[PDB]
Amino acid sequence: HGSHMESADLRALAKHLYDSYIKSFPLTKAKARAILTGKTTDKSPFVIYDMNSLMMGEDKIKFKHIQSKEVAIRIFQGCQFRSVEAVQEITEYAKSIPGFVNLDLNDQVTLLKYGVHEIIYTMLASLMNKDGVLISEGQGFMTREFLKSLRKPFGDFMEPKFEFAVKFNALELDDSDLAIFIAVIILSGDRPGLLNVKPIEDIQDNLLQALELQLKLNHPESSQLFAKLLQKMTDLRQIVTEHVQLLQVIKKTETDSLHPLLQEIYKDLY
Ligand SMILES: Cc1c(C)n(Cc2ccc(C(C)(C)C(=O)O)cc2)c2ccc(C(=O)N[C@H](C)c3cccc(C4CC4)c3)cc12
């Protein structure tokens, strides 16, 4: 429909959330895609396609701590070290969402608990194509087929992430669309264990309308793209369930997981 004063607010909200999306996250989908196509002035990332290429990229790494079994551990421990840094960047973006910090602190924890994994899955699509995924803030690129070649419990922990990304990146969403799409996931008013739901649903419905207005403007072709995104929010919860069910098996009937003190030692040291 036509414009008005309310449309001026949703476009300003979309820009405000976009400004926070650029600052909260260092590698946006715009630059992440520019690295994959080689059309960026930055150096080409190191490619990990076989076991031999992996034993050359680790020589560029500073540390050296964990045999064909230590590979599946170091690789898994790697994204675990980015997942902990992910929450740092996701929380800063969540705090920048207008009205999130005014919620109850117990709800802010509950929204971030069940929602951070879906954002990790969502933003992971911005870093990967049909061949591999960008790792270490665009410094490396690990092949999808190489992640399949890992040991049996670890050859299937990245594949659900690639299958969702191929269907998700087929929508050609940009940083402006993904900015509003993440906030809607954060402000999911039906997270198990919320205190005040009404103030959260007001923000989500406000973010939903700012998202639908964004998609109608930023995507003239392909109607019902807003309905396609809402189905992806339902797909993520099914994928996170299969991921958290697989993560508890590798952390209890496989690895030791990383020690709590060692993780903070590696964070502040390098
Ligand atoms: C498997 C893997 C993925 C898939 N990546 C991409 C990735 C991007 C972005 C995200 C988030 C969630 C932040 C996102 O933006 O969506 C997640 C995963 C990686 C990024 C870096 C590394 C990694 O080993 N680094 C260094 C070398 C490192 C740092 C500390 C400790 C160690 C080893 C214990 C000694 C290694 C691994 C991976």
- Nearest-CA residue for ligand 1 atom 22 is 78
* 21 is an annotated ligand-binding site residue: no
Whose Cα sits closest to atom 13 in ligand 1?
Answer: 86
Integer Cα distance of 16 and 216 in angstroms: 18
Answer yes or no: is the C-beta of 48 below 6 A from any ligand 1 atom: no
Q: How far apart are CA 200 and CA 101, in angstroms?
A: 11
Residue 83 is labelled as binding a ligand:
yes
Tokens of 36: 């994959």
Query: Tokens at residue 57, please?
Result: 């990229």
Gap between the Cα atoms of 241 and 181, Å rounded: 20
Distance 25 CA to ligand 1 centre (A): 15
Spatial separation of the C-alpha atoms in residues 181 and 122, rounded to whole Å: 9
Q: CA 147 to CA 151: how far, in whole Å?
A: 9
Q: For residue 133, give the amino acid letter.
A: V
Residue nearest to atom 38 of ligand 1 (CA): 79
Question: Following CA atoms 64, 65, 69, 73 in sequence, which dihedral angle do they give, to the nearest 10 degrees?
Answer: -110
Residue closest to 187 by CA, chosen among 114, 121, 126: 114
Q: Show me where the domains of the chain are located.
A: 1-270
Structure tokens at 105: 């602190």
**CB 61 less than 6 A from any atom of ligand 1:** yes
> What are the CA-CA distances from residue 168 to residues 122, 136, 147, 155 (Å)?
8, 22, 20, 22
The answer to whether the CB of 237 is under 6 A from ligand 1 is no
Distance CA 43, CA 118 (A): 30
CA 94 vs CA 3, 145, 243: distances in Å: 28, 34, 23
How far is CA 165 from its chain centroid?
11
Residue 119: name the closest of 212, 208, 188 by CA.
Answer: 188
- CATH 1.10.565.10, domain 1-270, yes or no: yes
